[PDB]
Design a protein around this ligand. Structure first.
Ligand code: NPO
Ligand code: NPO
Ligand code: ZN
Ligand code: ZN
Ligand code: ZN
Ligand code: ZN
Lengths: 362, 362
């Protein structure tokens, strides 16, 4: 059975289980069940399923080289699908809440969930909470008897926490750290001294890479009972490397990809985000370019946004991206080679993840 | 050592652990650590600690009648305090997010967290997420070796989910169920046909009673390794009964308690909530009273709110509350008597919880 067919079939099964349980144990009525079905579909479906499918693909790689009864193969793949959906539902939680936090308009070509007329922010915040709860409901139901339950739950909650910490790093990335204070309204930085590679790397590591790469790779190992067979320090290092590249691509696309292809209007410049573009620009600009950037960044004024995009264009940041990408290729290939010492099979799964990420539509 | 002294000492210890771990494992800087310390204090401290202290008091009751080394008593009480703080931090998560959802102004005599000048909704939504994550970080750290870890985590996530489901029941309680639809803006009910005792009871059971009574009572049993010694069906029934009374008191206070004592301005009438007052009023009103209620409920117009408060006053709902309270006393005393068959000690702990709830400042 093709992996994507299995993954989509398991979504339907998990949805039916969750909704049936709301009826049998939580006293839900049919109209509220329908609302939640629609909310689940709208917030969880429509992406590429990169993260959830990585769990499945990692598991498939081990199945190809390990002796198992057919029923065991089916169990492992079903578990990989459920675990993959846990990650997709965790992402859905963060996207619902982030869109509210940021006042975003569109996501994946459609209005953000909170903007649906019959949702509103009042309901959407709580819908996002439900999405997160569903990750645990599905784990306890499907994995109750499994030897990996404890490790999987502990990993999951640490990754969730890291993501929340990363969201804090991201939301505060345009303020001066020494002025942070709940009592005092926060002005945007004027010096941009905290727009550095190391500070950018911290934001991305926590906000993106743990849930986007580390969690699917390690969950794939756990459902395969294979974690002891790899060097975990290498898994962490390769996840953090590929995850940073993924986010750099997203940062470039926010500025330069036409919104019809992006699925949204990117607002990183208006929001004063510490993006790869801003950090890299400030790492090559002359004093006059720095001053013009300071005079225009972080403002909704469309003429000021256009000045920033022109500064970026004239600064030939495409060349910096090419150099960055070439270095990532060197480093990822090196990490894949190291992974082969203890697990050639897992190394190939990572090679596949990297190729997918590298070839992701620019 | 007095129980409250121990509980407050454990807060300081847990806070230090969480913040130290953010520095050692999550790359946090000192200013963001200070923000989170202040956020923790502002959102988690200042209440009565009814819920967290119930874990401690349940554990103390078993210690008084069970043979243990002194070091074991200290471990159990420390565990009860940590578990109690998990509940307090879960509540803090829901209060942060609920205040945003509802546009609330004040909580416990101070501005709601999102209204602090240097917080804002963008940060506060995520701060609430962090509060929830901290409940799991503390459990995995302090309870890693404990036999009750699995049961406690599974209970906790089910209660969290129930609370989210109850929030959905509460937020939608003023709309007609058959019109719920994410695509269509939701009008307030005109018939109020869903303002019934059974529908009210469903809202309260899920939104309040699981986290306010069931979770502290059962967590106290788990940290005491005593759950097998009680009839759990009775624990559920007594939690749901006392929890409903707690919420009825809160509903009355929202309308009639001066805001200086309440700590906020109650807005249930303007928000069209399915409150005990509204349900009970509609259960005794004549046609003219129903019509005037319909003409004024659910509107910010202060003159319309005053009409509703006068309808409530003239309807002698104080007498309905007295009758409701007398029935709760009958039923809670009956459940405490039944609890004595298998656990006289736990029965006394419940009797203490009931007395505290019954005597809670009106
Ligand atoms: O972009 N990609 O191709 C991805 C992204 C995440 C992941 O876990 C695997 C592949
Ligand atoms: O109001 N009260 O006294 C309470 C409330 C909750 C609880 O778990 C114990 C006592
Ligand atoms: Zn964001
Ligand atoms: Zn982006
Ligand atoms: Zn509310
Ligand atoms: Zn209330």
């Amino acid at each position: 059975m093709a992996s994507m067919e299995r993954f989509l079939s398991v979504y339907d099964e998990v949805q039916a289980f969750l909704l049936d349980q709301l009826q049998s144990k939580y006293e839900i009525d049919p109209n509220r069940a329908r609302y939640l079905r629609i909310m689940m579909d709208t917030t969880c479906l429509g992406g590429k399923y990169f993260r959830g499918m990585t769990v499945v693909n990692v598991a498939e790689g081990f199945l190809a080289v390990t002796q198992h009864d057919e029923a065991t193969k089916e169990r492992i793949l079903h578990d990989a699908c459920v675990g993959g959906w846990m990650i997709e539902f965790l992402q859905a939680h963060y996207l619902v809440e982030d869109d509210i936090m940021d006042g975003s308009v569109m996501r994946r070509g459609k209005p953000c969930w909170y903007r649906f007329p019959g949702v509103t922010t009042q309901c959407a915040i709580n819908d996002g909470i439900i999405l997160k709860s569903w990750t645990q409901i599905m784990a306890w139901h499907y994995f109750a008897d499994r030897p990996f339950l404890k490790d999987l739950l502990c990993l999951f909650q640490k990754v969730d926490y890291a993501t929340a910490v990363g969201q804090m790093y991201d939301v505060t990335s345009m303020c001066d750290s020494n002025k942070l204070d709940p009592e005092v309204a926060q002005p945007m930085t004027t010096d941009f001294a905290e727009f550095t590679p190391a500070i950018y790397k911290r934001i991305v590591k926590y906000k993106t890479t743990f849930y986007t790469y580390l969690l699917p790779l390690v969950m794939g190992l756990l459902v395969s009972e294979a974690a002891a067979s790899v060097e975990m320090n290498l898994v962490e290092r390769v996840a953090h490397l590929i995850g940073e590249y993924f986010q750099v691509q997203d940062d470039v696309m926010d500025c330069f990809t036409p919104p019809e292809q992006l699925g949204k209007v990117g607002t990183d410049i208006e929001d004063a985000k510490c993006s790869w573009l801003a950090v890299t620009f400030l790492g090559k600009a002359n004093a006059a370019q720095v001053a013009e950037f300071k005079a225009n960044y972080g403002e909704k004024d469309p003429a000021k946004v256009a000045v920033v995009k022109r500064l970026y264009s004239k600064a030939n940041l495409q060349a910096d991206f090419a150099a960055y990408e070439a270095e990532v290729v060197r480093e990822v290939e090196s990490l894949i080679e190291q992974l082969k010492v203890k697990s050639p099979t897992f190394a190939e799964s990572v090679a596949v993840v990297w190729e997918k990420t590298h070839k992701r539509k620019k």
